[PDB]
């Protein structure tokens, strides 16, 4: 027996970016390596930073302005024909172990009295350090003593605090930032048990995955509760005791009423034993169901009442179109003319009102629609789209193929193991003159400046359109993103992201500092908005016009003399990929002109609209790898080394080689019809690479491979053939012709 004292005892014993001219027509065989290049630097003098370092300004990893040199006034911005938006990405990985930002635990959050912005690297300490200037609204504030109490006699104590060293960091929020006590991660698995779901095997998979991954599901605070709802013509609840199991059949789908008052949303810890048991049975209980109805609407409402108290996440797994109940849907007429008005718009309006109710009780909805039949992804997406959830689509699912199971099961596994916050509100503040106008992404927003996330994933990206008022009187402008959250470990945190950008009245500078990727993303989001609410061509027209107006403005406002080379297509190096990307977009599944299944198109648009930037690009313009030439130092470094991607053109494909297309969704392995019998094959390498392109730590995606070489092979061919957006495909022009067309259009 040792007292605390005996324990201590025994123990003691300015450089503005320049414009580099290029000719898109000469820039043929598009560099393509550029797609990996980081955006133009953010020219900020060490003078503007309290503690100059690489961390004093927001990394492209967390935020990316489409403009790294901001027009000093609206006129200049308008003339530029360039978009001003911020590509935001609060979290970098699925698991908060990897790269967490610096975390303050101090409990002190210093903020401006006027604009309410938070302390940051670009603040100015005035009056013998007694005060600070808000770089956002320029109001003098009083520096709190706690800021210095770190090293009581060392004045340079402040400068050691994270909120002063880093543009991106987090805080442990003080008591006043909580009304209710941070929530416990709460899940609700609403699974389809209808006939289809049994025949496909979708059920056994879902129950198995979950069963084998109960350990993967987060439970940091150990308060993680869980629920299960099997659904068909009726909703089946399950009383789960602590460590007997009963099933409660409710077929009155008129009003949502609960069977009992407890033991349904149970502690993942204290009831695991029983939960595993229940999971074990479910496949048996429904081993043979002749029912063909799936009451999603009713089940969804019950679930709202089932977890709406504390709030949480309803994860839906289904292989059946909503069949019976409030939001039942029907197969649609299938198009081309006004396919948006009919095939993409939301059918029953229950799916939109439900998301409005989920905002009241902080519930999010995720969907895994795995089936060979119509699921109406177009209208169900609305669920996840406005609750910060995600809609995952698995076309042609059926246990008949050992792979459908691997993809789905792997993705579903990753999805439940991913972390997330609850009761999160994300907000962005702009310096004087900068104003946040529109907000794109999956979340809830009806009130400008504020996006609500009943829960916040780790695998999505957002975009905020910014307006440059009238004019910015200063040489620098700032943008601050604030995320107030309740982390899945019972903690209220505040994550801040502050970005400083140089202002300028030089259109040359504006262009010289444009983030072509961020811009490609900006228009991507603007087109996904059009495809879903307006026309599909209004979208296609938008993407083209964006490339047109820019080439037209450059030529007219920047180019100095027609005397240049031989009838070139002028632009700058940092935008060298922009026309190529936008064009590829028009050839993407979400915007193609032609015939595309209502679901595939809807799923595509949903994908593009929420994909993190890194993947949004690979999706638009795929990474092709010729593996027959492939270096020898590839195969291994514990990260596998990868080949340099070639152009996405049918050309480069040698009638005897081995290639590997990667469009972010699928994975094609095209082997020339006349290759050396070395086909028998190194094998470790190819298998190694593919494993690489699949295993990611920032998204859940699982690449389904497609091998190619009289009808079947023809389809795989036409399909893989369409992933190479540089050629003349889908009756759409080729990239060379694109530039040829654009040039003509902008030329007088």
């Amino acid at each position: 027996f040792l007292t605390p004292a005996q324990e201590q005892l025994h123990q003691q014993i300015r450089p503005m970016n320049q414009l580099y001219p290029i000719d898109l027509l000469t820039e043929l065989p598009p560099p393509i390596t550029d797609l990996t290049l980081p955006p133009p630097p953010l020219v900020i003098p060490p003078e503007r930073m309290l503690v100059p370092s690489e961390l004093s300004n927001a990394s492209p990893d967390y935020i990316r302005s489409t403009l790294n040199a901001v027009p000093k006034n609206s006129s200049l911005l308008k003339k530029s024909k360039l978009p001003f938006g911020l590509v935001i990405r609060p979290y970098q990985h699925l698991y908060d172990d990897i790269d967490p930002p610096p975390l303050n635990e101090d409990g002190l959050i210093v903020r401006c009295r006027r604009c309410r912005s938070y302390m940051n690297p670009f603040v100015t300490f005035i009056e013998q350090g007694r005060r600070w200037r808000c770089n956002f609204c320029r109001l003098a504030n009083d520096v709190p003593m706690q800021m210095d109490q770190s090293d009581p006699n060392d004045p340079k104590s402040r400068y050691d605090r994270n909120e002063i060293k880093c543009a991106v960091m987090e805080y442990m929020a003080p008591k006043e930032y909580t009304l209710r006590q941070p929530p416990p991660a709460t899940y609700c698995f609403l699974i389809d048990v209808s006939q289809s779901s049994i025949k496909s095997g979708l059920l056994a998979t879902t129950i198995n995955t979950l069963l084998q991954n109960l350990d993967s599901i987060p439970n940091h605070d150990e308060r993680t509760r869980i629920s299960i709802l099997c659904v068909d013509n009726a909703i089946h609840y399950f009383k789960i005791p602590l460590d007997q199991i009963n099933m409660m059949d409710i077929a009155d789908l008129e009003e949502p009423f609960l069977p009992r008052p407890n033991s349904m949303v149970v502690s993942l810890k204290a009831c695991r034993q029983n939960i595993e048991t229940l999971l074990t049975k479910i496949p048996q209980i429904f081993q043979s169901n002749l029912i063909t109805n799936f009451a999603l609407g009713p089940a969804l409402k019950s679930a709202y009442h089932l977890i709406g108290g504390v709030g949480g996440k309803i994860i839906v797994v289904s292989g059946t179109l909503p069949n019976l109940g409030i939001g039942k849907l029907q197969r649609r007429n299938e198009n081309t003319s006004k396919e948006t008005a009919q095939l993409l718009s939301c059918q029953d309006s229950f799916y939109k009102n439900f998301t409005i109710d989920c905002s009241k009780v902080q519930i999010t909805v995720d969907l895994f629609l795995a089936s060979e039949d119509y699921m109406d992804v177009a209208s169900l997406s609305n669920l996840s789209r406005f609750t910060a959830g995600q809609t995952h689509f698995y076309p042609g699912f059926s246990g008949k193929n050992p792979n459908d199971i691997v993809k789905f099961s792997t993705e579903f596994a990753k999805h439940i193991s991913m972390d997330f916050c609850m009761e999160t509100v994300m907000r962005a503040r702009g310096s004087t003159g900068l104003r946040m106008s529109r907000f794109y992404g999956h979340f809830f927003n009806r009130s400008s400046d504020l996006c609500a996330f009943s829960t916040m994933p780790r695998d999505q990206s957002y975009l905020f359109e910014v307006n440059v008022d009238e004019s910015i009187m200063a040489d620098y402008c700032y943008v601050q993103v604030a995320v107030l959250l309740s982390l899945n470990n019972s903690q209220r945190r505040i994550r801040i992201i502050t970005l400083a950008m140089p202002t300028t009245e030089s259109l040359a500078e504006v262009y010289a500092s444009a983030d072509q990727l961020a811009i490609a993303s900006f228009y991507n989001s603007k087109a996904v908005e059009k495809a879903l609410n307006s026309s599909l061509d209004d979208a296609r027209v938008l993407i083209n016009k964006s490339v047109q107006d820019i080439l037209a403005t450059y030529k007219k406002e920047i180019v100095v003399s027609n005397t240049a080379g031989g009838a070139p297509l002028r632009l700058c190096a940092n935008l060298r990929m922009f026309p190529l990307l936008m064009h590829s977009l028009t050839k993407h599944m979400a915007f193609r002109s032609g015939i595309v299944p209502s679901d595939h198109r809807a799923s595509a648009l949903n994908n593009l609209e929420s994909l993190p930037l890194k993947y949004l690009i690979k999706n638009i313009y795929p990474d092709v790898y010729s593996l027959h030439d492939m270096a020898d130092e590839a195969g291994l470094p514990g990260t596998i080394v990868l080949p340099q991607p070639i152009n996405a053109t049918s050309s480069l494909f040698e009638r005897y080689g081995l290639y590997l297309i990667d469009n972010g969704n699928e994975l094609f392995l095209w082997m020339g019809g006349d290759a050396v019998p070395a086909l028998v094959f190194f094998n470790q390498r190819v298998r190694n690479i593919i494993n690489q392109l699949r295993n990611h730590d920032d998204v859940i995606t699982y690449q389904s491979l497609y091998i190619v070489r009289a009808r079947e092979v023809a389809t795989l061919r036409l399909w893989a053939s369409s992933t190479l957006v540089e050629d003349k495909i889908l009756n759409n022009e080729s990239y060379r012709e694109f530039l040829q067309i654009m040039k003509a259009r902008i030329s007088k």
């Binding site: 099933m247 059949d249 409710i250 229940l278």
Partner: protein
């Protein structure tokens, strides 16, 4: 005699010699009727292992019996009822005094007619989960104990309820499940059928054999309903919905098939349908006063709801038993018809811990000497009568059977009329019914009546109980008539009619009939009260009236609406002997130097040195006088030498125990004494019969309009 005919036919007529005309029958005041017990037990009942010989007469259907005119030579029999000669069948063409068919040797007999080729008896348990642990635990104990008293091939059904109703599914072995419904909705057959339909409704009803372990485990694991009970509120209890679902499911797959819905409630329904009282405790349970003064706000919709269900189960031929386990009312007043339309049990108890509940509940599964249940199902009673005799109706737990071809139906009715055929989902040896007749006439003259009670025996056979009686009709004034008066029978049937009326001034009627009866039968001198004399065979009637008019079921003063329904339910079921104890309770005095002896129901008999035994049928009370209370209060009894004292304290407990033997339900037992707080029950039952009798004599000798 009076006892003979009952011992032999379980039949007791008010008048044993009928008047010869309807005018006479009216001047007799007390109707010509009888109290019959079709399934009465006889130590020597004759059972014919064959079908009855029915009358060929058009529109007759009466069965051969001892009062038939047997013609051996022409080998033919004449029918007493419809009066036609019928060809005596082939097997009977050899009738000797020694070779008489079984049906000719007794006036009451039972035939084992056909055999049902359908489902065993169904026991649908509907349990209320909104009760306390102790209460719900001892109920779980009883239900289990009963299960081992049921035929192993009996279909069991289970529903638990409170906030919502849960229909259990025992056909699932993977996981024990159950379909849930809203306790706040009035589901309809069609809707309920779809929702519940391996797919068939017949899966909620399974043989006890292939389910006794599951169902046992399930019952052993029941626990009080766990929803939250606000500030000053009663739990939400949707009985109304439970009974609605229960009767609908049964209708859905077992219509006209013996079923017995057994409800266990711990309080009033506090959720619509069938809402007795709102949840907020500030809302009190109605009282007779409230009901009388149209102030009972929930009462009329409730009655209107439960009656909808009663008509359903009765029409579908299902029984509904109601056991109440709580101090407050559950709504038996409103739910009563469920039990009276069908031959159901209706028992009011303070808790499921009471001996009254435990003993009564298990007694419901009592068996006969062959080891089969005494309860019988799907009873059908038809009353055939000569042409100079019609039927006015029945008063008991049955329902009228309409569209019959019967031609003996009177235009005037009493109780359930406009028919001579009735039906009982359930019946037993303990059920008696009051049939009232009308003399159709407007040298010995006889009238014949035949009771044909066809029903389903627990042994699984269909049987037909037949009772045939003959009664002589005499002219106005014949002495025989006045002598054939059965005053015990008359009083019971008159009370039966009184309860019926009261269930639909009743005392004003009782008083008038009594006065009219005495004016005719009493001997006296006009305007000379003190000359009033009633033959020994009428001398008790007035007394019976006196007690009846102030009994528990007519003068519902210190009664809760439910006590009244309870008392009345039993009264319109029990026989002559027991019904009298209900009217005029018995009091027996015990002492050291005497033998048990009958005493006047008054304070006179409350003495220090004696012990009293009061029998209200619903209650058995033993009051010890001060002295004896004191002596017993400490010692003597346990003293060898004071064995006489001991015997004294024991006599009232043996007579008590002998009464309790076979009685149903079991009465509440009370052991009190001078000073005890319960002594009130005894005293609160002790103006006077003297005054009554005096005022009575004055009116009997005076003229009316």
């Amino acid at each position: 005699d009076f006892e003979t005919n009952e011992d032999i036919n379980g039949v007791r007529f008010t008048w044993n010699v009928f008047p010869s005309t309807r005018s006479d029958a009216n001047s007799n005041v007390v109707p010509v009727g009888c109290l019959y017990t079709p399934l009465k037990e006889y130590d020597e009942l004759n059972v014919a292992p064959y079908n009855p010989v029915v009358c060929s007469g058009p529109h007759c259907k009466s069965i051969l019996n001892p009062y038939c005119v047997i013609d051996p030579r022409n080998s033919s029999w004449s029918c007493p009822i419809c009066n036609s000669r019928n060809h005596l069948p082939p097997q009977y063409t050899n009738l000797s005094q020694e070779n008489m068919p079984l049906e000719l040797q007794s006036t009451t007999i039972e035939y084992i007619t056909n055999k049902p080729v359908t489902v065993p008896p169904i026991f649908f348990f509907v349990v209320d989960l909104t009760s306390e642990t102790e209460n719900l635990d001892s109920l779980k104990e009883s239900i289990i104990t009963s299960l081992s008293l049921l035929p192993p091939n009996a279909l069991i059904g289970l529903i638990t309820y409170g906030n919502v109703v849960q229909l259990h599914d025992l056909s699932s072995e993977t996981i024990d499940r159950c379909n849930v419904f809203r306790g706040d909705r009035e589901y309809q057959l069609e809707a309920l059928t779809e929702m519940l339909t391996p797919f068939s409704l017949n899966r909620f009803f399974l043989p006890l054999e292939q389910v006794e372990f599951k169902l046992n485990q399930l019952l052993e694991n029941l626990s009080p309903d766990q929803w939250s009970v606000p500030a000053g509120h009663r739990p939400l209890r949707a009985t109304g919905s439970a009974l609605n679902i229960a009767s609908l499911l049964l209708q859905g797959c077992y219509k006209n098939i013996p079923a017995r819905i057994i409800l266990f409630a711990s309080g009033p329904g506090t959720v619509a349908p069938g809402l007795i009282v709102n949840s907020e405790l500030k809302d009190p349970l109605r009282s007779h006063h409230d009901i009388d003064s149209d102030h009972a706000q929930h009462y009329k919709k409730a009655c209107k709801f439960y009656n909808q269900i009663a008509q359903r189960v009765a029409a579908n031929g299902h029984t509904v038993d109601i056991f109440a386990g709580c101090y407050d009312q559950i709504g038996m007043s409103e739910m009563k018809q469920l039990t009276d339309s069908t031959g159901g049990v209706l028992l009011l108890t303070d808790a499921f811990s009471t001996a009254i509940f435990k003993q009564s509940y298990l007694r419901l599964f009592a068996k006969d000497e062959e080891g089969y249940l005494k309860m019988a199902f799907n009873g059908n009673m038809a009353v055939k009568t000569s042409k100079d005799l019609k039927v006015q109706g029945l008063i008991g737990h049955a329902s009228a059977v309409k569209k019959t071809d019967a031609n003996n139906i009177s235009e005037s009715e009493i109780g359930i009329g406009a028919t001579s055929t009735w039906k009982m989902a359930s019946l037993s040896p303990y059920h008696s019914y009051a049939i009232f007749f009308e003399i159709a006439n407007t040298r010995p003259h006889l009238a014949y009546t035949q009771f044909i009670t066809t029903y389903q025996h627990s042994s699984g056979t269909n049987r037909i109980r037949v009772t045939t009686v003959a009664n002589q009709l005499l002219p106005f004034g014949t002495p025989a008539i006045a002598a054939s008066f059965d005053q015990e029978a008359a009083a019971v049937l008159m009370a039966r009619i009184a309860v019926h009326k009261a269930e639909t001034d009743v005392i004003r009627w009782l008083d008038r009939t009594l006065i009219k009866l005495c004016q005719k039968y009493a001997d006296y001198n006009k305007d000379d009260p003190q000359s009033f004399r009633l033959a020994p065979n009428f001398s008790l009637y007035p007394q019976f009236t006196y007690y009846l008019r102030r009994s528990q079921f007519l003068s519902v003063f210190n009664n809760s609406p439910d006590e009244t329904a309870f008392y009345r339910h039993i009264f319109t079921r029990e026989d002559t002997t027991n019904s009298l104890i209900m009217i005029q309770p018995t009091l027996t005095s015990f002492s050291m130097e005497d033998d048990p002896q009958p005493v006047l129901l008054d304070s006179i008999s409350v003495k220090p040195n004696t012990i009293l035994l009061l029998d209200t049928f619903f209650f058995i009370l033993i009051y010890h006088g001060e002295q004896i209370a004191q002596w017993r209060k400490a010692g003597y009894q346990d003293d060898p030498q004071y064995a006489d004292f001991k015997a004294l304290l024991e006599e009232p407990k043996l007579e008590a125990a002998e009464l309790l033997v076979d009685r149903f339900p079991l009465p509440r037992f009370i052991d009190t004494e001078a000073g005890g707080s319960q002594a009130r029950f005894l005293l609160s039952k002790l103006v006077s019969l003297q005054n009554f009798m005096t005022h009575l004599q004055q009116v009997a000798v005076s003229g009316q309009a």
